[PDB]
Amino acid sequence: DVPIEKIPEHANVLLKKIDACLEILSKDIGEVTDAEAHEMYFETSKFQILHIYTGCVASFPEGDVPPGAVECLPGQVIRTKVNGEDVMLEIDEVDPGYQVCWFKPDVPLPENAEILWSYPYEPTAALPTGTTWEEGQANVLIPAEPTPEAAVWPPTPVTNVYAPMAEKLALKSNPELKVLFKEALLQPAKLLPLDVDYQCSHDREVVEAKRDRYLTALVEAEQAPPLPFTPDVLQLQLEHNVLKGELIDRLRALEYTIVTEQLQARLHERRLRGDVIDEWEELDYHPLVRDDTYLAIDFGDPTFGRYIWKLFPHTDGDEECMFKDTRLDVLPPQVNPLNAILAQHTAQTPVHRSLEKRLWTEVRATAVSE
Amino acid sequence: HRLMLDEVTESYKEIFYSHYTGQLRDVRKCAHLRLYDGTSTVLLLTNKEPVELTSELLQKWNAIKAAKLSPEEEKKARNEALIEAYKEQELHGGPHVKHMQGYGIPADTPLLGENAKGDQYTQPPESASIPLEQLEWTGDTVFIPAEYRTEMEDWGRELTKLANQFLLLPWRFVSNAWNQRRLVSWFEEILQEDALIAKEGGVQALSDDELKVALLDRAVIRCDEELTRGDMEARYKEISWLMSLRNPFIVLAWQTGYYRSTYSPEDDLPEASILPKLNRTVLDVDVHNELAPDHPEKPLPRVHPALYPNSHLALAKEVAVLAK
Amino acid sequence: AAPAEKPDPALDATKALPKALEEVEFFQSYAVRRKTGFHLFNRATGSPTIVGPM
Amino acid sequence: LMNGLKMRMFSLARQQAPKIVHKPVLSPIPEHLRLVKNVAQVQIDMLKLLNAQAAK
Amino acid sequence: VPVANFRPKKPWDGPWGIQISQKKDRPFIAMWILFPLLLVDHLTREYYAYWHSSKVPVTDVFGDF
Amino acid sequence: APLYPVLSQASLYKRHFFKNIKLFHVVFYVGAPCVTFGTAAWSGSNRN
Numbered sequence A: 001d002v003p004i005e006k007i008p009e010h011a012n013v014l015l016k017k018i019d020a021c022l023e024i025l026s027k028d029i030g031e032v033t034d035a036e037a038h039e040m041y042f043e044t045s046k047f048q049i050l051h052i053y054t055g056c057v058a059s060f061p062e063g064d065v066p067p068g069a070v071e072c073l074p075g076q077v078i079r080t081k082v083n084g085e086d087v088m089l090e091i092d093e094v095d096p097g098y099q100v101c102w103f104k105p106d107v108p109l110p111e112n113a114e115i116l117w118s119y120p121y122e123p124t125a126a127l128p129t130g131t132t133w134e135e136g137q138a139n140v141l142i143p144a145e146p147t148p149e150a151a152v153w154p155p156t157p158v159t160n161v162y163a164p165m166a167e168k169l170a171l172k173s174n175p176e177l178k179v180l181f182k183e184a185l186l187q188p189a190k191l192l193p194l195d196v197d198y199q200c201s202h203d204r205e206v207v208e209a210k211r212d213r214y215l216t217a218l219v220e221a222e223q224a225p226p227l228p229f230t231p232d233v234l235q236l237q238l239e240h241n242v243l244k245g246e247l248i249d250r251l252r253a254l255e256y257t258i259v260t261e262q263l264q265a266r267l268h269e270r271r272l273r274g275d276v277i278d279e280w281e282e283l284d285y286h287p288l289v290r291d292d293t294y295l296a297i298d299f300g301d302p303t304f305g306r307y308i309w310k311l312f313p314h315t316d317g318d319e320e321c322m323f324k325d326t327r328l329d330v331l332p333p334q335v336n337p338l339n340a341i342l343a344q345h346t347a348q349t350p351v352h353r354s355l356e357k358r359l360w361t362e363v364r365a366t367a368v369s370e
Numbered sequence B: 001h002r003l004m005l006d007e008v009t010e011s012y013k014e015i016f017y018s019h020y021t022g023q024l025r026d027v028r029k030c031a032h033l034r035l036y037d038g039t040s041t042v043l044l045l046t047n048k049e050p051v052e053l054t055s056e057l058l059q060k061w062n063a064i065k066a067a068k069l070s071p072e073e074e075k076k077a078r079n080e081a082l083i084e085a086y087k088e089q090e091l092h093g094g095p096h097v098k099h100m101q102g103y104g105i106p107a108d109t110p111l112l113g114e115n116a117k118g119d120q121y122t123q124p125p126e127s128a129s130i131p132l133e134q135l136e137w138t139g140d141t142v143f144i145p146a147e148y149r150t151e152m153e154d155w156g157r158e159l160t161k162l163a164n165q166f167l168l169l170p171w172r173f174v175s176n177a178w179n180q181r182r183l184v185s186w187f188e189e190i191l192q193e194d195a196l197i198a199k200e201g202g203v204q205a206l207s208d209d210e211l212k213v214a215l216l217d218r219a220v221i222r223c224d225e226e227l228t229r230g231d232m233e234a235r236y237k238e239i240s241w242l243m244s245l246r247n248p249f250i251v252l253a254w255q256t257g258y259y260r261s262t263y264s265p266e267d268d269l270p271e272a273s274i275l276p277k278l279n280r281t282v283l284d285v286d287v288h289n290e291l292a293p294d295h296p297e298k299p300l301p302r303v304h305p306a307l308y309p310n311s312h313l314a315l316a317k318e319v320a321v322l323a324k
Numbered sequence C: 001a002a003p004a005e006k007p008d009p010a011l012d013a014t015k016a017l018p019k020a021l022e023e024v025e026f027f028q029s030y031a032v033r034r035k036t037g038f039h040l041f042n043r044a045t046g047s048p049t050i051v052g053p054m
Numbered sequence D: 001l002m003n004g005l006k007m008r009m010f011s012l013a014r015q016q017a018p019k020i021v022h023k024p025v026l027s028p029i030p031e032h033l034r035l036v037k038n039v040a041q042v043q044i045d046m047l048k049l050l051n052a053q054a055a056k
Numbered sequence E: 001v002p003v004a005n006f007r008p009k010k011p012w013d014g015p016w017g018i019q020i021s022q023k024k025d026r027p028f029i030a031m032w033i034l035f036p037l038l039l040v041d042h043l044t045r046e047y048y049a050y051w052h053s054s055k056v057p058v059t060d061v062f063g064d065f
Numbered sequence F: 001a002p003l004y005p006v007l008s009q010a011s012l013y014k015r016h017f018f019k020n021i022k023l024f025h026v027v028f029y030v031g032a033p034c035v036t037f038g039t040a041a042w043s044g045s046n047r048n
Ligand SMILES: CCCCCCCCCCCCCCCC(=O)OC[C@H](COP(=O)(O)O)OC(=O)CCCCCCCCCCCCCCC
Pocket: E035, E036, E039, E043, E044, E045, F029, F030, F033, F037, F042, F043, F046, F047
């Protein structure tokens, strides 16, 4: 009660569904940038935080420190305002033979000092302006973040032998070609250059056998079939019904997995809105893993890893197997066991039975004919 | 890494994680779990030595039993096959039991001290005097499953109780031996019921409710499924063949796969499906063909029985039963 | 009886002392101090004390 | 990077909403469905050719 | 027709995950109530016997005395 | 259409305060008053 033409409609539906899933799941949450979440990273620095909004910062060679200058060693955190942006600067890898210090305006600068960046004079101002790092004053590097190639699943190839045959059918299935056959067999003298043939030809038997060959070639052309062989319709309907059932069961399994993908996507929608999801509330949206995980808890064995290294031996020795995706490195082979089965069948059978089977097929063809 | 085997891995995955994929399972992949065990043997006890039973000897004995000969000829042919198999195994290197940890055949007893008569350090048994041509079967048999990992003894206090719960048997406040006997009695009942169904004309002679109740007794169906008749018949055939092998562990592994149901947290999801219900037939079950264990991380697709050569000939019984 | 087990790298000991030295280096990194306001009474010889600079 | 200095700059702003990054999710379901599509089209063309032969 | 291996929840399916979280974090909540109670129980305590004590605090558990 | 008793964002915000404690966050924060006003330093000296 389910014809084979109705399948691609179902495939279109499931493609729409999984695309609506993957367009959501392709998004992911980046690193958090809230300063309130990372203020303790600066609280726990090896030096107290310098709230610098006045004076200048200068680099000068190592040696005696000017009295009044605040050293800025590696690990020093500095709260400033840069081009209207409140920022924290963490000192890292000051060059050798040189040191950096904050010089308030009360402090005179030494000789051979280089002002890296300076602040303006704004004593009446309540909200200071900070600095303005011009192009060439500071080389700021944005991380490149080269987006690698999107992981594409390999499409398996499918040899369509019958599409050339469909094209040949579209070619032969014309009314004009049959009209030409109808007017060629009735009057083939029109086509051929018979007056020239009889003129040059010394024996009329050649011209007669020539026309008798063209007639037979035309009768064979019209009476030939689209195919070059005699298909056994029973074995083809057999393979068709088997492949149909395998396709319906495959579509049912894919819908079964799509349900879990549109569940993980319905949950990921909330995560994208900024809502915090509990670990177990999130596990409930993975019901099949939730069940097996709950049973592992019931048993009480929190260990893991050799089970993975046995089920997927390509991960053996890989401690960071969980943080990778080697499904493309390890794909199921496209080998047909039917070839090994027919090979063992031919190896067991003799040759006279193979020729007998050719006779059974020929007699079956004549039986279907009669 | 110390306990599992790397060749049964893909079959293990297909048997225990098919609720993830939604694909059907092949019973032969559950039968592959017997690779954890050793070779199950059957020693026939004779008046001289024990002999390991083989498919050839069993075929000969079935042929002699089918010929319906006089007992004077029957016993003679049986003993001829017996001495032939004895010579065969003596050329093989003795029975399989000699070189298996936990089992063994003793050699001739030793002679201690002054009882040792020079070079003859041994004392053969009385039956060594009997000539080999008088080899006769005593009528006694010894079955040795050689279940080193599957045996019901090593299961434990919990697994047996849970198997009896799953089969709706009594389980509380009893030893694992008594629950084992209860399980074996249930198993015997199911086999006798299979025999009576085969006498009464198979599964197709049964009604729908009767088949539903049979599958509930076999513990392969839950009442929240509403399968078809062909699916029910195929399921029965599957578990019938699997229980013919007489192994509760693989039986339970097969049965438990049909009882992994989930609950969704949302009301809209899961959506109403578009495809029809899953339907099968008795023909879809491949029992008459062997299946090698798939190599780890190299699984092979499933071949229908119809694609095999001479399938219309092999399935002719099932074809006649279904078309009729 | 003759199990033939391969060596497991997780059972080796080649990370405990490096990790302890990493923890101690993290500890001593917070001992870095500037030159301004620095004073430490040395011993009578002029050599530094033990507890002083820590 | 400055002359005689290197530094790490951190912004100071409350993040009101999460930052999204397009990490495409690998899945075999679309290729499964496309394989099903191709096989079904093969069988449909096969049936059409067989009907054309048997009737013409 | 619905999808297979799916069903509605039942009482024997146990509590939900959010309920399991609410069960888990109750000890963590009672921690805040009990550690101050521990410190108060230690600080507001008095010894029970001295060199001058003619009596010792007795606590009849079952009222037999 | 979640069928479970969805827990509010503020309730999760409050429970996170209770379950995001660390071991040192308990040990040192409760041991300092304990060690100072305990059987070692103050209460012990008094009561002994
Ligand atoms: C000349 C007198 C001595 C010198 C001058 C006075 C002392 C001045 C020094 C400062 C005051 C010392 C107080 C001594 C009190 C004492 O005797 O200590 C002992 C007494 C109890 O001793 P007794 O019961 O035996 O009399 O304890 C108290 O007084 C209770 C004080 C409560 C303190 C709580 C502090 C909480 C801090 C926040 C921590 C948060 C973490 C979570 C924990 C819940």
